[PDB]
């Protein structure tokens, strides 16, 4: 946001923030409109810009205030756990953060409706942080999660698929094939 | 499209199709505006709707005529090759069809700017066990980076080599050497 959002009442500022948060719970970035946020607050459109550069600013701020990087979970897990242990724990961490939490809808949009522009501009702060390992992991997990949201999966069909595919990655395609013959 | 588009004389129909095509070579489906295509044909806006149900109709039509499903290429390799043979040739096939191609920009948009609405409604002219899922994820990501980071053929080939090798050897094997 701008300095002009930050020096607001710890009461007044929450009115506008929460106002945004609702739109973003109801719309993907593309579906979301400055109009809705602004009419919700009952304040002229131009006043929106006293706080944000554009809708994207508020989007990324809300996102940064309500959501974490899925893979940060796994990296932190890696401290006290080996790779495999971390992998088997990660699935549950994913379910806890993605499904049962107030940020469900946020994430649903974060994963089903995410374009190049968003991808390109989104950056988060990092106390523990392009190598092939994390590329493969991220792809397979993000795909699984994509299917969790796009197919309204139950925790058990998620854990089932997750188990299969992650097992494949860790044991490797060659193993997985000669195991089943 | 609509019947009204197919019963169009060759010259005409080709004019329309090319206007569309040209729009989609320049714009993501979200950027593509039905108005641009219509202005470039010098026809009013509601004429588009003689030929298409919406922009999406035209989009999908152009994709079905100009592009392929990259994973179809791979399966096709499998029918006559072993799994790792297939994997190794795949990268080259991928390059051939995605890059040295007139449809390059089309693909670029297909990978950089897809939406759930798009993915849901998209039905091409061709199962999902874990193999094809994992392979598909890893590869689409590789290709995403190929397009978004303007990778050389060699850069793609390098990253692909590494990551597919991880997948076939498997994580644990890969990291212990």
């Amino acid at each position: 946001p701008k300095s002009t959002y930050f020096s607001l009442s710890d009461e007044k500022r929450n009115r506008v923030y929460d106002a945004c948060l609702n739109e973003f719970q109801t719309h993907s970035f593309h579906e979301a409109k400055i109009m809705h946020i602004v009419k919700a607050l009952d304040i002229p459109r131009g006043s929106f810009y006293q706080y944000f550069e554009d809708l994207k600013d508020a989007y990324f701020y809300v996102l940064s205030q309500e959501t974490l990087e899925i893979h940060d979970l796994f990296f932190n897990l890696l401290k006290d756990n080996s790779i495999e242990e971390s992998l088997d724990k990660y699935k549950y961490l994913l379910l806890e953060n993605l499904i049962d939490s107030p940020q469900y809808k946020l994430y649903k949009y974060r994963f089903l409706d995410w374009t190049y522009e968003l991808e390109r501009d989104w950056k988060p702060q990092s106390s523990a942080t392009d190598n092939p390992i994390s590329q493969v992991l991220k792809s397979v997990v993000h795909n699984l999660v994509y299917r969790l949201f796009s197919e309204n999966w139950t925790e058990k069909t998620f854990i089932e698929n997750y188990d299969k595919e992650i097992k494949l990655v860790t044991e490797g395609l060659l193993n997985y094939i000669t195991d089943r013959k």
Side-chain angles (χ1 to χ4, degrees), chain A residues 142-158:
Chain A
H142 284 52
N143 184 247
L144 276 159
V145 164
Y146 190 84
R147 306 184 285 154
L148 169 75
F149 285 111
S150 78
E151 301 218 327
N152 282 317
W153 274 0
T154 64
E155 301 176 346
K156 76 177 179 278
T157 44
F158 182 79

Side-chain angles (χ1 to χ4, degrees), chain A residues 102-134:
Chain A
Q103 3 281 334
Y104 174 74
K105 269 267 179 58
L106 266 337
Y107 287 118
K108 184 143 158 282
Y109 291 124
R110 215 192 149 326
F111 281 89
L112 263 25
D113 289 309
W114 191 261
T115 44
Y116 184 60
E117 181 196 352
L118 300 187
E119 172 74 343
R120 179 190 75 218
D121 296 348
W122 172 254
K123 10 232 191 183
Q125 51 176 245
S126 195
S127 222
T129 143
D130 182 64
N131 72 284
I133 320 292
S134 60

